[PDB]
Write a protein that binds this ligand. Sequence first.
Ligand SMILES: C[C@@H]1CCC[C@H](C[C@@H]2Cc3cc(O)cc(O)c3C(=O)O2)O1
Ligand SMILES: C[C@@H]1CCC[C@H](C[C@@H]2Cc3cc(O)cc(O)c3C(=O)O2)O1
Ligand SMILES: N[C@@H](CCCC[NH3+])C(=O)O
Ligand SMILES: N[C@@H](CCCC[NH3+])C(=O)O
Lengths: 474, 469
Amino acid sequence: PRLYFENRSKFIQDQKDKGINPYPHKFERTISIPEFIEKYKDLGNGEHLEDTILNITGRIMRVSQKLRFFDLVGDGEKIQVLANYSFHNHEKGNFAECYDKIRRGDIVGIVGFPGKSKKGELSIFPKETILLSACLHMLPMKYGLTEIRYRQRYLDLLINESSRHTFVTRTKIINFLRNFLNERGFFEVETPMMNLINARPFITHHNDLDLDLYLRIATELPLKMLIVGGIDKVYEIGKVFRNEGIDNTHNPEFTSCEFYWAYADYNDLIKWSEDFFSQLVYHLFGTYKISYNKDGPENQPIEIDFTPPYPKVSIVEEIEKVTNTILEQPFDSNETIEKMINIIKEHKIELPNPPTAAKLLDQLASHFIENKYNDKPFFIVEHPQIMSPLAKYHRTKPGLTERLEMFICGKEVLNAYTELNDPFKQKLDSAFCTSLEYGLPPTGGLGLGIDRITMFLTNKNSIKDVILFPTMRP
Amino acid sequence: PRLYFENRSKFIQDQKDKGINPYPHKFERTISIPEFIEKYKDLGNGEHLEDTILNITGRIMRVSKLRFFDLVGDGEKIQVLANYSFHNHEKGNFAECYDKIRRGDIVGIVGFPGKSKKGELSIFPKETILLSACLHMLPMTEIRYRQRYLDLLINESSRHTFVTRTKIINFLRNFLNERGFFEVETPMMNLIANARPFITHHNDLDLDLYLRIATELPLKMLIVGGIDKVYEIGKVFRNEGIDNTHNPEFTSCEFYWAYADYNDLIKWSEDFFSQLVYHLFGTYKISYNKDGPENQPIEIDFTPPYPKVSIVEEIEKVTNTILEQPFDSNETIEKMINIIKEHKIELPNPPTAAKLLDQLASHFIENKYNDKPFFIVEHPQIMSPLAKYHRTKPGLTERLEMFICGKEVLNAYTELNDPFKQKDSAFCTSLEYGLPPTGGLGLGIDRITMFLTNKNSIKDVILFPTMRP
Ligand SMILES: C[C@@H]1CCC[C@H](C[C@@H]2Cc3cc(O)cc(O)c3C(=O)O2)O1
Ligand SMILES: C[C@@H]1CCC[C@H](C[C@@H]2Cc3cc(O)cc(O)c3C(=O)O2)O1
Ligand SMILES: N[C@@H](CCCC[NH3+])C(=O)O
Ligand SMILES: N[C@@H](CCCC[NH3+])C(=O)O
């Protein structure tokens, strides 16, 4: 009843006073729990491997006359502990005084032999049990977990069995991406997180240079510079910081991977995306199809099919076609801008302030196009050069660029394009523009939204679920 | 100077004006330069394979009826041997084409593989487009760190450096993963080691956040969560001084090993460093120019085991003094401060017991060896707030630090888990939920790279080091 702590703290101090160390230095375990289940799951009911002493450790998660049961968890797997007065080595002390000290949450060292119960329960049978690290608080009951999960993540990880899955998956995702690129000749680099130079940035102050720096909003410019350097296939997975608002799909600090492929272009990157996504999902599910609760764990889930190829939708054409309106170039012209503001009002969507063309197009696309498909990922392609300042101009469609955005359930996870490489047509940094002048070969570059990808492949509604310690208000 | 540019700027506008695109969208290459060298290195001199048309790209880096070039791709050079005989004059005039190709230019080449009468491996072109023009004059200081891209292009070893750095990180990742470890990302910004933080403001939360100075606290929490083998390779931000061995943002790996201890973490370190060095050289011994490429190199030997030198014992034994505990007593502080003046070393201000032990160690132990890496073990508790108390030696902790050529590259120890002896609120609370016996270790990736690439300065091992404008 929440005063357990003071009790437990006193007991610890009492243990110290009686000369016993309750936080011992090293216990030499000879096997882990996942191994123990792997090694011993094929013993027959009631069988004991009486002549196999093992040193094993875990965390007690249920303390169940002269006999005691326990639940021992470790690396996310449990076995049972069957301590028996008959089997206890009495030289180490009074059996019932030894086990009456063990609480739920306690971390223990067990010297015993591997066996099974009459029921066929795989267990370990100890001669000796030592307390290695005690749990002083009252641990939440199995399925007793809100907003405790995000602050006290360790508690989430210990009680809620799927929580470990989420984060194991997350790493399998990154491990994949790393290999997928490395196999394809790519070369992982580190670029600076702090700099002198579209999103509002985080600002911080360097002391020994007495200068205000800006935490990076992407990894684009330094990466492109390395292509100039002759590192033809280059990539970086890392944190990036944007100072905008927070929601279920947005978090101020988030993981992103960008790569730059020299001599490639739009079409190569479309192939890349399709190849990567389909394979990744298959690597994790043995199928290109997954279930996904778009509306929540209470509502019916939808099915997403990752079988390539995926649908391509052109940004301009589609909006025209959905509204029966035609949008004359330049898109920033007074006739065309005023036309869009009419469409935003005529369909009653929230209007962006300030109303600049590219910002009006994004909101239009956002409402009309971005919910075209939920059952498969799809691309929105060939964005106008006004939305796409660093992208190469479309080689046949004037005004547009060779740009792609991939969408899963209406949210953006990928963004790539052919890199504008002619320094003249680049109408940002002095160093960057200087690099262009030294010759950037035809390049195609892409970026992934790791956390959003992780959300979809772990069936989560909130980005906070797939980040270990999300940035939260106190 | 500037004129070279102005001319090339115009040569572009002229080519654009003339109906030719000097920056085309795509070129369909079928082989890379390293691949070209692999498949065709065994050709006999002067022998051609005129019936194998290949598409190749690269950068022109030397310009010699016949026109010679050097084409570089991914860190290797091959010769372009342009011959009036093979030139497809339907595309353009042989001379009117190759006259406009300057040094630095990136070009697409359609030709065939073969060697010159000399036996030199070349590429024999029919057509040669301009893929991306180089406007500035390439050099034949402070340019290296500012414009790394030039450095990677001209200096052949600059690439070997950064390739080695990536090989080093990859090695580490596999080493840990192979051993059951689990890579994570703990948050880059926090609400709260001993070092000055970077501070920044989040607008929409209206809250001021500190950039992480270490990964120690949130990793240790995950061990509480049951992730018994957890790690992170990532940047850490310390708002400190800058020099050959310090850079406000650097790359660290911290890993946390539940059920291990001080003794295991030595074996781990000895194992890892030896194995890494053998991976990159095929020998446990390397050469390192401590004083510079002009002065004689010393030899660094990575054969296990390495020496363990006890920090208190060693200072004591070296100065003929004893330092009575507590080290923070008026008695012992004065005895320390006196040794600092008596051997004309810089006194740290504030002179706290913890910092005076540091400088004393810094001068009197930290250059004990240079021909082998060595550990400094058993630091006092007043130096080691997160380190578990030594199990036989009162006042000491179960800590280790490993040094190569006077510089610290590894800091590790048995973790303190008795939340009582821990004299962040989130972090403190977790220890109350039970942190098992754990070992835990940190590496300086940027320094380790300096030593394994023979480099005097941390800047040489960072692609775009943070400079003054
Ligand atoms: C670098 C990647 C490229 C693919 C799409 C994503 C788009 C969003 C933008 C974004 C902005 C933001 O302020 C916070 C975010 O988590 C995210 C996010 O989840 O990724 O960005
Ligand atoms: C956290 C890691 C553990 C291993 C040793 C290094 C210690 C030094 C400290 C340090 C501080 C600093 O402000 C900048 C640095 O590059 C370095 C560095 O290279 O490593 O730190
Ligand atoms: N920097 C882009 C991703 C890569 C686009 C291609 N250079 C973004 O964050 O949207
Ligand atoms: N956080 C330590 C490295 C880990 C030492 C063992 N917990 C440091 O900043 O150097």
